[PDB]
Amino acid sequence: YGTVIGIDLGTTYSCVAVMKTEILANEQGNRITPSYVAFTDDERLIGDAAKNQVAANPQNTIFDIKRLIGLKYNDRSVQKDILPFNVVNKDGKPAVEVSVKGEKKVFTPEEISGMILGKMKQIAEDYLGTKVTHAVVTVPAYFNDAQRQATKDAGTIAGLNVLRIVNEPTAAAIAYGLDKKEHQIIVYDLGGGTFDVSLLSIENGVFEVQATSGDTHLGGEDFDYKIVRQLIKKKHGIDVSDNNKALAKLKREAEKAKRALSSQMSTRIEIDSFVDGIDLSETLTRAKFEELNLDLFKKTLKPVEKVLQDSGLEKKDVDDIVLVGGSTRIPKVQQLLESYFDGKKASKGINPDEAVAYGAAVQAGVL
């Protein structure tokens, strides 16, 4: 098998890890890599390079392909998700259409995910100094056979034998060693684009997914967009709502501002210079960020309630709470979940962006 790697192939960001479990940093030094592929005339871009030029090349930059993987073109979720790039119908399945050198190119979601998985493998190969041939790859619990198989096929495209397809909540629980006296585990997974709640039962090293719920269109980017709207709104006579280049700048800084307010009470948002030649300089309090996103924060507790009643469980029956995703760092999010579980503190120690890949790598090390 060689050295088997663990890969969190996520909606907005991907992550690699190997077994002590280490999270692998990319060529730009980032431990998470954007699930982005861009098609230019000069080269194919994957990860940070692709995301950084999304504004300049919106038609040929693909993202959120995990939303289309393993599904049919006529599916209601696919029709809903169909966005700035052309999605076509290729044999009853959604496929992306890009233009390189004046000719159209059609790629399947397996192929696109295979490019991202290819990047993740290359990072691992530089980390290890050896070839990587085998991987454990994670998917959401609600993924069906077609979506799981499409993820396997994406591995094959990247030259990876995906030995196991593991559920993300399970991988997160594995990372915290909760696999090792029956326990009931709540996994609260607030990612960049999707929100997942799972109840897992762990028996004698055996996990079972007892119930799942959530919101496929509630994530960190939705909390970011609330900051972007604030930066748009007065001091100057310029509305940047139609300026995609300027909007991409705001999204970057709003992402940084949310991360800063998880540790600080205030943050300095500055772009020198934003539009034309004029500076943008705004202060955002944690209180203002909480205020704008309070309805979205409280809405996350509904799927937690649904998970508990779809199982045979009360709040007190929950033995462990695992936090997954960047937005679980937000003190208000933690506060609302803690008081929902009557003061029950969540597990901590692992970066919530890296917890899924961590657990994937742990199971990979056992083969």
Curated annotation (Swiss-Prot):
MF terms in GO: ATP binding; ATP hydrolysis activity; ATP-dependent protein folding chaperone; heat shock protein binding; protein folding chaperone; protein-transporting ATPase activity; unfolded protein binding
Region (Nucleotide-binding (NBD)): 93-242
Example of a GO biological process term: protein refolding
Name of the top EC class for this enzyme: hydrolase
EC number(s) stated in the UniProt entry for this protein: 3.6.4.10
Positions with a binding annotation for ATP: 10-13, 66, 192-194, 255-262, 326-329
Keyword Ribosomal protein: no
Protein keywords: ATP-binding, Chaperone, Endoplasmic reticulum, Hydrolase, Nucleotide-binding, Signal, Stress response
Regulation: The chaperone activity is regulated by ATP-induced allosteric coupling of the nucleotide-binding (NBD) and substrate-binding (SBD) domains. In the ADP-bound and nucleotide-free (apo) states, the two domains have little interaction. In contrast, in the ATP-bound state the two domains are tightly coupled, which results in drastically accelerated kinetics in both binding and release of polypeptide substrates. J domain-containing co-chaperones stimulate the ATPase activity and are required for efficient substrate recognition.
Origin: domain of life: Eukaryota
Localization terms from the record: Endoplasmic reticulum lumen
GO cellular component: cytoplasm; endoplasmic reticulum; endoplasmic reticulum chaperone complex; endoplasmic reticulum lumen; endoplasmic reticulum membrane; luminal surveillance complex; membrane; nucleus
Substrates-to-products reaction catalysed: ATP + H2O = ADP + phosphate + H(+)
Principal subcellular localization: endoplasmic reticulum
Subunit structure comment from the entry: Interacts with EPS1, PDI1 and YOS9.
Role noted for this protein: Probably plays a role in facilitating the assembly of multimeric protein complexes inside the ER. Is required for secretory polypeptide translocation. May physically associate with SEC63 protein in the endoplasmic reticulum and this interaction may be regulated by ATP hydrolysis.
The family this protein is said to belong to: Belongs to the heat shock protein 70 family.
Other facts noted in the record for this chain: Present with 337000 molecules/cell in log phase SD medium.
Protein name as catalogued: Endoplasmic reticulum chaperone BiP
Originating organism: Saccharomyces cerevisiae (strain ATCC 204508 / S288c) (Baker's yeast)
Primary gene name: KAR2
Covered residues, full protein: 49 to 425 of 682
